[PDB]
């Protein structure tokens, strides 16, 4: 297993996806034309995981760009690396999704999904040993949420032996266009619990709180939030893209991080937290890196880890640092915080270390937690879903697309079952 096929759907999915590709292109020495210009051979060793090699020492993202509205095409192409994508992998429709999960999942999106699968099929056939799929999307819209989850279901049925992994950004009133986002997100979470193996929960509530309260940005923009998203996506994929000793891949991560199939929603974290063009993060040591990494303020999901228990944890340290010091700091955190790691999964905290740091930093750490405290995120969406649904507000936008009202009650029911599952393992004892 090596190659990953990347899909970005909808406005949010394509915006964070484009950022992802310009970030890792820089780490791997790839310029906006696809040519390599790096100073380390480690940048090429695992390049095929995300890139197809082209005719003349040129590298093309294994990325499929999808949206039901054409406006996001132009913007992505206008971007710094917009020309590096394969033009045939732009699969876009004419009329958008109107922030309506049902349009994305049942009407407009169902018309376009077959065109997308033709491109996915092609990209998979040229893979020496495809390991799985990675999707970037938001859950609060219509395309990334409605058509995204439909794409996941259809890919799941055609490539059932492959890993399905998503970067799913959760809506928040703090960064909100409409009050139907809880509808769209709850319907999507229903699909995600069943058809993905691993989901990275990127919470816009957390991203806004970081920018506003920690970074002191009085009025955060999408570029501010996406600064944090791209840093997080770079960190969690570091071990897929560079050698190291772990020989990490999407299936080994899933096998070791997901003890129960439905509880596969990860809480990511990052340290140091910086804003664009600041350079303030300088004197950062291994004890500080480790403390911040587990700090609730550094989580990309708006959840307090100390209100739950960690089932599993992976920590990725990047940069030159004392591995002797990482191990003593990592053991230190586990011993003084013993009450926040379940006792019935021995050795459930994994340390990975990568030589090559990200741009602008010499030391950095990335956190991936499977914590029962993520139920706070789903309880927040659920309360908003219920507040709207009990008043039947805007429901005709969904039933008017052939959708049945019981689909809402079943999504509501499934998400509340998911919350009860987390609580069950939060209170379970070894005994």
């Amino acid at each position: 297993m090596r190659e990953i096929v990347h899909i970005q759907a909808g406005q949010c999915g394509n915006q964070i996806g484009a950022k992802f590709w310009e970030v890792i292109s820089d780490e791997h020495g790839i310029d906006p034309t696809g040519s390599y210009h790096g100073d380390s051979d480690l940048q090429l060793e695992r390049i095929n995981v995300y890139y197809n090699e082209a005719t003349g020492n040129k590298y093309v993202p294994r990325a499929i760009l999808v949206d039901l509205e054409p406006g996001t095409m132009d913007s992505v192409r206008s971007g710094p690396f917009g020309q590096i994508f394969r033009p045939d992998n732009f699969v876009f429709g004419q009329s958008g999704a109107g922030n309506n999960w049902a349009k994305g999942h049942y009407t407009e999106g169902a018309e376009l999904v077959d065109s997308v699968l033709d491109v996915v099929r092609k990209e998979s056939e040229s893979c020496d040993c495809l390991q799985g799929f990675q999707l970037t999307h938001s859950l609060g819209g219509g395309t990334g949420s409605g058509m995204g989850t439909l794409l996941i279901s259809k890919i799941r049925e055609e490539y059932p032996d492959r890993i399905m992994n998503t970067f799913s950004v959760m809506p928040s009133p703090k960064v909100s266009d409409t009050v139907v986002e809880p509808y769209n997100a709850t319907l999507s979470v229903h699909q995600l619990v069943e058809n993905t193996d691993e989901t990275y929960c990127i919470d816009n509530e957390a991203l806004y709180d970081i920018c506003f309260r920690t970074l002191k940005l009085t009025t955060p923009t999408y570029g501010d939030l996406n600064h944090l998203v791209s840093a997080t996506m770079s960190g969690v994929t570091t071990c897929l893209r560079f050698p190291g000793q772990l020989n990490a891949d999407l299936r080994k991560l899933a096998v070791n991080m997901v003890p129960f199939p439905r509880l596969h929603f990860f809480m990511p974290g990052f340290a140091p937290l910086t804003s664009r063009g600041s350079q303030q993060y300088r004197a950062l040591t291994v004890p500080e890196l480790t403390q911040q990494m587990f700090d609730s303020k550094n989580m990309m999901a708006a959840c307090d880890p100390r209100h739950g228990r960690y089932l599993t944890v992976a920590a990725i340290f990047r940069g030159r640092m004392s591995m002797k010091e990482v191990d003593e700091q990592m053991l230190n955190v586990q011993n003084k915080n013993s009450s926040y790691f379940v006792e019935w999964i021995p050795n459930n905290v994994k340390t990975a270390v990568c030589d090559i740091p990200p741009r602008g930093l010499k030391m950095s750490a990335t956190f991936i937690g499977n914590s029962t405290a993520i139920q706070e995120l789903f309880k927040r969406i659920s309360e908003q879903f219920t507040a709207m649904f009990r008043r039947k507000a805007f429901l005709h936008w969904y039933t008017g697309e052939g959708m049945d009202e019981m689909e809402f009650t079943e999504a509501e029911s499934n998400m509340n079952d998911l919350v009860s599952e987390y609580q069950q393992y939060q209170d379970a004892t070894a005994d």
Binding site: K174, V179, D209, E376, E383, R391, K392
Partner: protein, 155 residues
Amino acid sequence: DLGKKLLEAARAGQDDEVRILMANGADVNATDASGLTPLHLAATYGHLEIVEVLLKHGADVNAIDIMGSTPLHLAALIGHLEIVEVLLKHGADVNAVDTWGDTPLHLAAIMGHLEIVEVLLKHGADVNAQDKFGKTAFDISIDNGNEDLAEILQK
């Protein structure tokens, strides 16, 4: 029946049809099957001009549907700030309770409409009002970790 047409005109935001229908005798306080009035629907879908028109022609600002929802409940839930203040100006009950024990303050807090929250507080929203699970708006803000909301609610 002009009432059904007024209900659909108010929902759709068809200002001119609302004017003509009331000119032909349409029941400003007509109800659909669940007890929603034209004012309920105009307040839900953000039609400020229709809200003001209905209130000038005898709409009951505090009417309840079958579930106890008043127009202010729905405007506070959806987030229509200016409609909230028109409703309060015309005598809306800031502390009306629906069948789930929710007040307008509960619904604005849950949906994160912080400016509406502030408005309701200045108009005497009951900070001790509990829903059927015993939660006040401040309880909701503590449970969901909404620090901005919690600060607003402590004045």
